[PDB]
Amino acid sequence: QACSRTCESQFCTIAPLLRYGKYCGILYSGCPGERPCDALDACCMVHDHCVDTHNDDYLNTMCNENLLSCIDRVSGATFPGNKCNVGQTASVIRGVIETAVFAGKILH
């Protein structure tokens, strides 16, 4: 219930408040079985489930580095009504994940 079935495009350039697609955003995720909204959204869906299936470790290196690889290869159409620039938003996301990767190496 506490999940998204709609493709959002909100606070595109503000990482703490960003909500993009059904999956991209902090503590913001699509409901079970929900199709991602575009290529960027699909990267975020995989990442979200990866963290979920690794004891909620948002600093997991696999999860995080896999998202970076995925982000760098994002292309194609986006969903209707998208207020965000896809490339600019992927960059915003990438910065957050870079920070998480660095945080993980500090702690581990």
Ligand SMILES: [Ca+2]
């Ligand atoms: Ca999310």
